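To the wet lab folks,

You asked to see what we're planning to order before we commit. Fair enough. Below is the target structure as tokens, and below that is the sequence we designed to fit it. If anything looks off to you, flag it before the synthesis order goes out.
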């Protein structure tokens, strides 16, 4: 039932998912002047050398690039995290226009899109169990701005025509997520939630300060995807972002001065 339209969008989600008005919902605005530098935060450890991508799926609200998460092949460690978090999938949120699309904002600034690399804590055995824990997930959030092309993104862009509509998937092996990372791993971190239903409060958010640049042509191809299934009326997959939620009793920490 839920989606991003006028009648099923973020402002309606609380009726099926009351945690939508919870105490640690995501995304949030990152007020850069109020975020506190935490010198005890460690460098982030992004170890994607052994990543095994498998498939790309249009799920009706975004597209997921899925990875083999049955071994420690692509893991996130360090930073605010205790233990080891395995990469399971990544996806993006984006706008109908370059001036919006990101979920997190920075001093109220909206980026054209936001990449989420979703990882689960191996102490909980699988993703389904992890989402039931307050430290179950670590999502690495990376802002996209429109400028120069991101070469490492192009393989993703070029397969999208084969998964235009909801429920379509395509083989997507040997994709290297390292090609989507910015130079710096400076980050902000805070406790939050899944940003789509079921909106579970299981995420340590790690949002990188440095955006990546993608080309206008690259984001335009995102906007050619469909929310609908094949044979249903075409509704472009755009503006699949949840707006900033109240920070409430939370402090955003920065890894950098
Ligand atoms: C629930 C859940 C639990 C177990 C297995 C699958 C699923 S799910 O696929 O139905 N839902 C999600 O994975 N939700 C999800 C994932 C990531 C994000 S986020 N915060 O990166 O945008 N939001 C929601
Ligand atoms: Zn997301």
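Sequence we intend to order:
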């Amino acid at each position: 039932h839920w989606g991003y339209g006028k009648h099923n969008g973020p402002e309606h989600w609380h009726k099926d998912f009351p945690i939508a008005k919870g105490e640690r919902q995501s995304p949030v605005d990152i007020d850069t002047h109020t975020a506190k530098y935490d010198p005890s935060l460690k460098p982030l450890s992004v170890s994607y050398d052994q990543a095994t991508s498998l498939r790309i799926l249009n799920n009706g609200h975004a597209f997921n690039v899925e990875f083999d998460d049955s071994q420690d092949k692509a893991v996130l460690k360090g930073g605010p995290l205790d233990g080891t978090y395995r990469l399971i999938q990544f996806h993006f949120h984006w706008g109908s226009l370059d001036g919006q699309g990101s979920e997190h904002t920075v001093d109220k600034k909206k980026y054209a899109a936001e990449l989420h690399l979703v990882h689960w804590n191996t102490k909980y055995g699988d993703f389904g169990k992890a989402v039931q824990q307050p430290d179950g997930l670590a999502v690495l959030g990376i802002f996209l701005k429109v400028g120069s092309a991101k070469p490492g993104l192009q393989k993703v862009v070029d397969v999208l025509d084969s998964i235009k509509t909801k429920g379509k998937s395509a083989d997507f092996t040997n994709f290297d997520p390292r090609g989507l990372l910015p130079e710096s791993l400076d980050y902000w971190t805070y406790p939050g939630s899944l940003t789509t239903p079921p909106l579970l409060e299981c995420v340590t958010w790690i949002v990188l300060k440095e955006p990546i640049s993608v080309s206008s042509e690259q984001v335009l191809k995102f906007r050619k995807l469909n929310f609908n299934g094949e044979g249903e009326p075409e509704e472009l997959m755009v503006d699949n972002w949840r707006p900033a939620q109240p920070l409430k009793n939370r402090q955003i920490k920065a890894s950098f001065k």
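Structural context that might help your review: Residues 144 and 212 are 5 Å apart (CA to CA). The longest helix spans residues 216-222.

Thanks,
Computational group
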